[PDB]
Symmetry: C2
Subunit: 151 residues, 2 copies
């Protein structure tokens, strides 16, 4: 048989890797978007410094995948994508919880509060394949059997 | 591999919790019409037309009224509604059924029997219907790997 977690989601951008072995997973419950004289150029600069430092905080932990319960701005997607990091957004709180237990990650809010132990490594394979008309993400091969349910 | 599951998997669940979620050698009947009204005999008739063919499962692209659910349920028939046209097609090839519109035009030939197992289990927070054990080697795609 097969064990792990299966969620009805796909990467945020097509270029991102849909197949990753021994994934370093990072779970979030916060949003990766921005919110809150030529104000335009000015607003673009404020937004960019935010997202940049948010992404830098995440990247500083060299993760393979970054999953969040909220959304991910297009700018953020590109920065993560530019660090070879796969991103999944709007993941159900429940699913996000199942993934946490399966790979041993700890869901965090602001990236800057991450530690090495927060990053989950109990999952040995992240494969996003297409079934029917929808895409599904599969997190399987758990360093701990019980830590994962049967699929 | 030998651990590769072939068949069809759709993000759907039965209409009524009382309906069977597990059925071996399903007699599947596909529809693309609605089993609603937009009365209490249009549905009876409709259901009677479906039941006549003694099916195990009745799947449709449209909706199914509560009254209809009940009649089908009483005839030990599992019903799935609002299935994508694409999924409905995939199921048609997999079990060999012919999607029909009007329940009267149905015939023993439209009832798919190429599927050997209809199992609706839960995964995560959602329910998924699995139609597997295809008699036709060139009809079902690989769902889950070994």
């Amino acid at each position: 048989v097969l064990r792990g977690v299966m969620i009805n989601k796909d990467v945020t951008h097509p270029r991102m890797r849909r197949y990753i072995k021994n994934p370093r997973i990072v779970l979030l419950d916060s949003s990766l978007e921005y919110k809150k004289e030529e104000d335009f150029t000015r607003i673009l600069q404020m937004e960019e410094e935010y997202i940049h430092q948010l992404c830098e905080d995440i990247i500083q932990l060299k993760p393979d995948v970054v999953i969040t319960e909220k959304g991910i701005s297009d700018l953020a997607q590109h920065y993560l994508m530019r660090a070879n990091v796969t991103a999944i957004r709007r993941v159900r709180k429940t699913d996000n919880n199942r993934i946490a237990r399966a790979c041993g990650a700890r869901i965090v809010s602001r990236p800057e509060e991450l530690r090495e132990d927060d990053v989950g490594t109990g999952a040995g394979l992240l494969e996003i394949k297409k079934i029917g008309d929808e895409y599904f993400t599969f997190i399987t091969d758990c360093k701990d059997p019980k830590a994962c349910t049967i699929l």
